[PDB]
Design a binder for this molecule. Structure first.
Ligand SMILES: [Ca+2]
Ligand SMILES: [Ca+2]
Lengths: 223, 55, 223
């Protein structure tokens, strides 16, 4: 996260890390058996690491569970990143405690202005790279689809929201993909793509989760 | 450098490079989108009226 | 047109050439006052040259009329080339005679297999460039959306059809953009984009005109 803070213990319990050797993306726990991430984070073989904080040392409070099902949104487009959302069903339910917990799907969409908390173990340098052991957090508002489109033209579809600052300096970055953008206690975004990190006039584009709630419902109940 | 390039059939052609590359697009590229994975899947959204490099 | 034939006199009367100094794209006459072309051919200032056969010499049977209105499809995307269609309203109606005539919009869509005639004054070499004086014609079938998608993945939307040959050798090429793909006497396609020209496995992608008939109707009637 470029320019955010160390999150503090048991602050972000739905944060999930996707591992296949090492952290390559993050995700959110949405119920004891299903994690939501981004479709471009797909691998066959993903190990979900739950209750993580320092991902570099084992602190005995973590749960590592293999993914049994990895399902990318059917209409996901690898070139335009539209419908960038993926559901992972865990081969065993995570035991929910303080360190491990569920985010809620949206009662509705966020309105331009709402502040949110973005979180991840991704890079912390817009120019260069440092990869933090500890989970980084960032407060940022949802931008207007109008700002979002003017910032990235011909690219922002109606399933993508920009969250961040037009003046740069604070943003999600590589390693954060798939992570949560939680606003008012509801998961409104998934970190997806962007032009570089924390650049001026380039805010993060996140998958608009309010558009997919019934798909999520439908897949969880049908699998 | 570019392997896949999609040009319109205009004089001059409007060309795009379709390659998703590893962590990078190129150094000649002013419109590079990357996913925020580790590594990033990056694509150069540049348009050039003729179709070669970006490098 | 790579690998097609010289069209023969008064064979393709709806063919239009868009000029702004010189031929840069083509189009079709759809009624005496409105030409349909492709949205990526937009210039402010276009001169429509009608009844053209040899575009290099004046043969006294041509009509040159300025465009008064150039309207690109509202949802046209310059990056993915979706909704690549444009309507030009002529500052005076073309006088319709044998050399100048109207194509019909679709009663329905073409079905994979239908033979069509593509036409234009664009390049004739897949490798290199020759630009013909005389209008070139090419007979080619509409491919299945399934072949089309497998040939260009993540790129073919539901407003694009592939017409041509998976073998290669015959296709449209630069200079033909905007031109007609007429099947059964109905304009089913507009030439748009492709990787290279007449390449193996890379047939041309054209704008699917049956999807826009009511848009064409209301723009013509509302302007
Ligand atoms: Ca740990
Ligand atoms: Ca002439």
């Amino acid at each position: 996260i470029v320019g955010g803070y160390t999150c503090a213990a048991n602050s972000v319990p739905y944060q999930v890390s996707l591992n296949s050797g090492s952290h390559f993306c993050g995700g959110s726990l949405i119920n004891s058996q299903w994690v939501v991430s981004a479709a471009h984070c797909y691998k066959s073989r993903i190990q979900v690491r739950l209750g993580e904080h320092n991902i570099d040392v084992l602190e005995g409070n973590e749960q590592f569970i293999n993914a049994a099902k990895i399902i990318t949104h059917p209409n996901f487009n690898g070139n335009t990143l539209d419908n960038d959302i993926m559901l992972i069903k865990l081969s065993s339910p995570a035991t929910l405690n303080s360190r491990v917990a569920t985010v809620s799907l949206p009662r509705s969409c966020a309105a331009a202005g709402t502040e949110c908390l973005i979180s991840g173990w991704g890079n912390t340098k817009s120019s260069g790279s440092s990869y933090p052991s500890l989970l980084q957090c960032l407060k940022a508002p949802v931008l207007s689809d109008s700002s979002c489109k003017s910032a990235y033209p011909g690219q922002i579809t109606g399933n993508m929201i920009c969250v961040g600052f037009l003046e740069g300096g604070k943003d999600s970055c590589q390693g954060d993909s798939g992570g949560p953008v939680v606003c008012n206690g509801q998961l409104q975004g998934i970190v997806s793509w962007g032009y570089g990190c924390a650049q001026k006039n380039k805010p993060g584009v996140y998958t608009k989760v309010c558009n997919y709630v019934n798909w999520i419902q439908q897949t969880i109940a049908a699998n | 450098c570019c392997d896949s390039c999609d040009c319109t059939k205009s004089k001059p052609p409007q060309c795009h490079c379709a390659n998703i590359r590893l962590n990078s697009c190129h150094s000649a590229c002013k419109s590079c989108i990357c996913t925020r994975s580790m590594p990033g899947k990056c694509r150069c959204l540049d348009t050039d009226d003729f179709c070669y490099k970006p490098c």
